[PDB]
């Protein structure tokens, strides 16, 4: 486990539009432009977000990154229960010459 | 996978010579780079 | 379809030699590094490794620097994670993974499906 730091448990209404927080060092995410995962439990894992913004294929237009240097955050807009899933912050970085992840955003619905 | 035709490796070796000229020589150069975010200011001596 | 196919549930026993395999189908083999990562379960996400297959050339993890051996082949196109010496810790689940470097950033697009290493007691 690398330093970044990640809210590790989030929740909210169905249509609610969670905020995932993510910073650190700033050779991890100030350096090398930060990346979005997801892993649903039981799975593999899957990229959600890189280069701050841009998404691989597979990936819903809900999911928004921004970077503000050392500091990001994951906008996801419209919940449904496809988010029973950990979100990790993450990057290849060369600060311990890593893909470096985070502390993981899993969430439910009540 | 292989190199060969319209597939070259992403790095190409340095072509450096004492013949070559000051502009065709290697440079050793420094960026220094600084943020200003809310923390003590680090590196300070010179101004007193 | 894109995909690092890794074997079943491996069950060995600890102190020995094991291979693991990961099969690279659906792509360009040696266009893409190749990500070997753990999954001890119950533990935020771990990593183990990332290799080019033409040279066997590994950004390695600093505290496991020869204790994983990493080997990735380009003609059986296939990344061979071994250790010669198993343990306790080994026990995890591990994924492969193929970056997305076609015209884009160092993400982790395509990943392996995920096989657990288990010594039964």
């Known amino acids: 486990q690398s330093v970044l730091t990640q809210p590790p448990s989030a929740s909210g209404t169905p249509g609610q539009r969670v905020t995932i927080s993510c910073s650190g060092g700033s050779s991890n995410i100030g350096g090398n432009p930060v990346n979005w995962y997801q892993q649903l439990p039981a799975t593999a894992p899957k990229l959600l977000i890189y280069?701050?913004?841009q998404r691989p294929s597979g990936v819903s237009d809900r999911f928004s990154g921004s970077k503000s240097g050392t500091s990001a955050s994951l906008a996801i807009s419209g919940l449904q229960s496809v988010d029973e899933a950990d979100y990790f912050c993450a990057a290849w970085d060369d600060s311990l010459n890593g893909v470096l992840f985070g502390g993981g955003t899993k969430l439910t619905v009540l | 996978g292989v190199e060969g035709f319209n597939c070259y490796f992403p790095l190409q070796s340095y072509g450096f010579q004492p013949t070559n000229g000051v502009g065709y020589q290697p440079y050793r150069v420094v960026v220094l780079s600084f943020e200003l975010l809310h923390a003590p200011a680090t590196v300070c001596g010179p101004k007193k | 379809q894109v995909q690092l196919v890794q074997s079943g549930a491996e069950v060995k026993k600890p102190g020995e030699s094991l291979k693991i395999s990961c099969k690279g189908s659906?792509?360009?083999?040696?266009?893409?590094?190749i990500g070997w990562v753990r999954q001890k379960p119950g533990k935020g996400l771990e990593w183990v490794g990332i290799i080019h297959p033409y040279d066997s050339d590994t950004r390695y993890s600093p505290s496991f620097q020869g204790l994983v051996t990493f080997s990735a082949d380009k003609s059986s196109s296939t990344a061979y994670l071994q250790w010669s010496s198993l343990q306790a810790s080994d026990t995890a689940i591990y994924y492969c993974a193929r970056r997305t470097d076609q015209y884009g950033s160092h993400g982790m697009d395509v990943w392996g499906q995920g096989t657990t290493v288990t010594v039964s007691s």
């Open positions: 280069n701050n913004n």
């Open positions: 659906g792509y360009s083999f040696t266009s893409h590094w």
